Symmetry: D3
Subunit: 254 residues, 6 copies
Amino acid sequence: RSDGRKEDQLRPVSIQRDFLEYPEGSCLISFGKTKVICTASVIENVPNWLKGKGQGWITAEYSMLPRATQQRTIRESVQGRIGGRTHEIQRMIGRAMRTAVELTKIGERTIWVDCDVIQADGGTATAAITGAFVAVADAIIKLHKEGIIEETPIKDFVAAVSVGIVNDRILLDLNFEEDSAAQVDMNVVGTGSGRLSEVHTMGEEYSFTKDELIKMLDLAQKGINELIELQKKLYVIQDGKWERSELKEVSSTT
Amino acid sequence: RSDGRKEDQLRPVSIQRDFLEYPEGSCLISFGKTKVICTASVIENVPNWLKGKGQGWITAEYSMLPRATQQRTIRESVQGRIGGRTHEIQRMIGRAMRTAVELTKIGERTIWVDCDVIQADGGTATAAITGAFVAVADAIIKLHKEGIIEETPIKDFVAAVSVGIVNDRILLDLNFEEDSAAQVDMNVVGTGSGRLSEVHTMGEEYSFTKDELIKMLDLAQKGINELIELQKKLYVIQDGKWERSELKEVSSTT
Amino acid sequence: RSDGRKEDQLRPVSIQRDFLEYPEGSCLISFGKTKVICTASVIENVPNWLKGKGQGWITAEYSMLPRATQQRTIRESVQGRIGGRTHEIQRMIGRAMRTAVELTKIGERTIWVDCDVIQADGGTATAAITGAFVAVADAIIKLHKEGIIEETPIKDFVAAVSVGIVNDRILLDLNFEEDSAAQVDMNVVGTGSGRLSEVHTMGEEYSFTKDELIKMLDLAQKGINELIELQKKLYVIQDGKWERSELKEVSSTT
Amino acid sequence: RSDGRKEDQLRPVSIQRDFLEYPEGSCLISFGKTKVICTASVIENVPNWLKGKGQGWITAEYSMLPRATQQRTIRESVQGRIGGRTHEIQRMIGRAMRTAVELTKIGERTIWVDCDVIQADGGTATAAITGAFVAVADAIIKLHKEGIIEETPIKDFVAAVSVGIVNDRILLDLNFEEDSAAQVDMNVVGTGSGRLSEVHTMGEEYSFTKDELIKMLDLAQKGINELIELQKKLYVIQDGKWERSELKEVSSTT
Amino acid sequence: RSDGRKEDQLRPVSIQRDFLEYPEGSCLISFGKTKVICTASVIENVPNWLKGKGQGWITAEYSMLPRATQQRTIRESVQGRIGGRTHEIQRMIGRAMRTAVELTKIGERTIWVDCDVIQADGGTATAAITGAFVAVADAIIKLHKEGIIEETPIKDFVAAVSVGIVNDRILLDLNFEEDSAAQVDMNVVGTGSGRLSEVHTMGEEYSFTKDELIKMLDLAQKGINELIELQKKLYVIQDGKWERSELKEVSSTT
Amino acid sequence: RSDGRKEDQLRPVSIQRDFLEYPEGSCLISFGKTKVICTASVIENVPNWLKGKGQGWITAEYSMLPRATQQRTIRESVQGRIGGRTHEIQRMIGRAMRTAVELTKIGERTIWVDCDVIQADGGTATAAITGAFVAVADAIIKLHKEGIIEETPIKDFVAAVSVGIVNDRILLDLNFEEDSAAQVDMNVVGTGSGRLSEVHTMGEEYSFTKDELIKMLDLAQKGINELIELQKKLYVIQDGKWERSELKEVSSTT
């Protein structure tokens, strides 16, 4: 592969917590040149349709700063029309975070997750999900430490990674060139206990077999596991009680 | 199940070609109460980025008439903001159609696919993909018969179906109630030769296992096969040459 | 005339009730190649400005599926700006339905009328009004049969037709070619008892005389009457009590 | 009537030409408290679809300054959604101006008509059409005087007025209260030679008869004639050559 | 200078109160060819965030009718995207009016200020502020005379003017040509007692010195004073009680 | 002051160049808790109105990530309406950068400046201008080193700072609390040689004197000078030739 990386090998991964001061939780995550700021802010309110249902909510906003993929990704501000792509990913990030949290125990508040891609080189959505978790966990731990909530109702770790078939090779965690040249690309969102939260496989004018899907899913689950091993070094958990470890940054040895 | 249907059983399916006169291809497809009008219109032009590249294009527009799911699905007209959901599905339908067609041989024109859901009861997106194919195939056959193009460059049939886990039961082709009550729902897009074009599995605040994904994918591929057997009765193909059969409508015996 | 039709002759008309299952009322109407799906759905609420005024409301949404007039009528979704034309017609349809109904007796609910043009060849707005009535009447009858309301407060039938001056000939019910070539075109909305609800005459860079307006209005009222004779076969009315006849479809003998 | 005005009587009318300096043509017209600034500006270009067709174009923009009808008519700027009503009227004004001008002889340029309602008390659209004509005529005369065009290709005067049925009385030129209380209201656009350009009659939850329409149309044509007699004092015409008279303002004696 | 005007000389200024009848306050102001209609309307309500805070509010809407600067300034209606420029000026006008009024004493109502530029030749924003004051003062006086409020809580006069450096000359009140050719342009908003409310100086690809800023500010304050001397002739004030003088129009002797 | 800072004292300032890899120039700047990512990307094209005029262009995009001022600043994406405030600042940043660059010598390309506020505590716009310069200078130096352009046509350093009057005290560089409580706030944009590019002073319902403006401007120019002394350590310049120093980060000793 271009970067001299193996086929079943992730790019250098780095996760830095406490990136910013104001959010209850925040981090700067990077998969290679792909960099995303993930923040988690508590809003002392809930969406109208949940009012009074004794439950919290998590929702997410994703944005790709104009300078992405070394090209131009002009925001949704000084422009107009909005892409259902940004929306597709925001919904993805939202589903991943809610699956990992027992919202029953968050109280009637909302964790507003913001994922700001400050540099894109493929895998930006899976990088955002991986980072968003750390920011959400930190934010729940912060809320607990402040006494706003009784426990730290986090069910499990959540991470995500991309995989694809390029020139008939199954590659793990694709950068932008590999993805634009892929016959089949795929995003996988997994949990700490080895389960799955989401899987989206797409043939790019090429079809694939059930077996190729499984091969890809197998490689992705291994990628997810390595990412979760990194995330794990950031926490100290016991019987459902979460505390942050003393690490402020964790990175892959690659 | 509510409708007395089995777990590995599709709802009554009906596909009617030549539903409208003006489009090069058109049909009314129905999966139960879910009904979608699928039309395919040729536009003698191409997207700027393809100009001169000796190739055709296929793109799709999906809309859900206000009266859907027995509720209100107010269009994107007399309103304002647009959902990335409509966009997510339009992109899905577009990918499915392009995968099934050798665009090299369509010439520099575009097949504009319109999917109009006139009644929603779950599975509307997979129903639209299933119907869109018939309209695209008919339209290519029509273009051939008119002498606009040399052959009928259709690679294979394409159909799609939903599957999910509801109250820990794996169900095929979900209606709206089963889907809103599902722990995991999934859309699968497959081909004539038994391959896959797309798979999207989503945990709805529940995670799942690789094996459950495979069980679901297995049930879906069987569903896809039954839908493609129906579609097949509408065509007579030999060595890549496509002609319409004499059927104007095909329906499942259920 | 192109289609071999006489000057004071309507195109073949067809009205099919119960086209869809979910709406309280629904039909597929066609004036030649012009086809419109008209549905009427009850929303158990009212516009804020009517709250508590012991009255119901009727409002309408009109849309022209991209494939219309054998050309491209891209919706208001994956685009942006909205035309005051769609709005002009929605307001027209709304005025026609409210005139035909004693809203005092509908209770505080709204009949949401949806007119979806699935094929356009001129006269689409008058076709929608003609069809919308049948869907609204059926919906009121349905509400009565369900016991939601005491009576069937329908004042009279409502239908509409276009007329114009083309190459100095006064033609009834124009298709798309006649209308684009017309010096003066006009839409007329009339009632069962031979009265008028709306009339809009427009010189297309040509002016006309009071007498020509009357000639046109006379031809239109005859057209309206024929359309209302068709609609009438769909109902059995006595002393203001409306019941559906046993016909599911009615068509002109032409 | 409220203002002590007769049923077949217009409000005090005033037309002032040369209201502004920059536009080729401009005026401030008033029907009672209804006041509209009408300007006509030449743009040395044409809409793409007319390029090279040896013809000019006229199009119009209508706006209702927030302070209208003594209430709030917040513009389309610091808001968002646009009403098809503004559009309906802009199209009306456009049709009226083009009918009155032989566009063949204007050259490939466009007369951009701007109608700015600075005070609304009913009849604002008909007032705008009445005023827009004067601004368009002046602008064509100005273009001629500057040598940009050979002649003054104006076919005839154009004016417009409203009429309605209120408490079963047929009233001419309605103010805002009469119009909101009307059973049937109507806008009529007529020419110098007594012909018609447009007529739009609308039952407001009340239907009407062919004869009532004629009575109303008769009253309107008389109103149109009085307005055109005023406009006429502003010009000196002979064999199709138009020159401005020496009047800068003309008003009705009422 | 082009118009034969001196460097420290304003263009001919004219202010006409009672321009329209419906607004509580209104005027037509002109700085040369720059003309702006300024109206002030009372809305018996307040912005949600002020509800119950025993205070009034003033906000402003600015619009530039398509015919401005002898060019085309197409509104925000039949277009789409909005400029932050219109917003920048609306905020400016809002700040100027609120500074001049003791909102504590207006009650819980809002003065809606509308500034409609009907002709642009530079200095349109400062002209609007100058005119908006007169309309706001008149409106407060009107509210007092109607007994809606106890006193006339107007703190002081407010006026504004532009100044710039053109070909290294410091000019007062620039028309459109001088401003587009300026190296540095500036808007100043001042009060009756010689104080300042706002100052915005902008280098147009040229930088300037603190001293040049002061020279410009000095010239502007003299301009502001002359404009306020004009405004003053429109009122008769004593111990904070404001009454209108008998002048309906005031103009500079130039 | 709250933070124990003096009245004529800036918050701790930090500027880090090469923050990201893809942009030709980039940095993370911080004034206290106020943090902004500033990137400069070259687009090998120019705005249509400049085509062929042998000149380059600089334009800017500013955005405030939802998590700002410890509150919610929801972007312009999944929302709709846009604020003229974002636009006001983008125009400010654009004017500052163009003033500092001899665009004649950049060739026909555009430097696209992106300012992404990742944490807001007042002074975010002046912080963005201060940071944007460093990114633009680096980008021009980068373009030179790559041989795309002959020289490094940078005229001078540009920096900006806020100042205000709070409880009658003139404070330098205000955080969010001081600014919301200020009677008069002001933004100043200055150059390396001690000149000014922009000054915007705004009374917040309070007026001020020419002398207070000068006092504030004096304090700001001292602030600008300190910021420019920091920026200066990042470059080594001689006779108009710019090279980066070896520092990657520079911070104030405070």
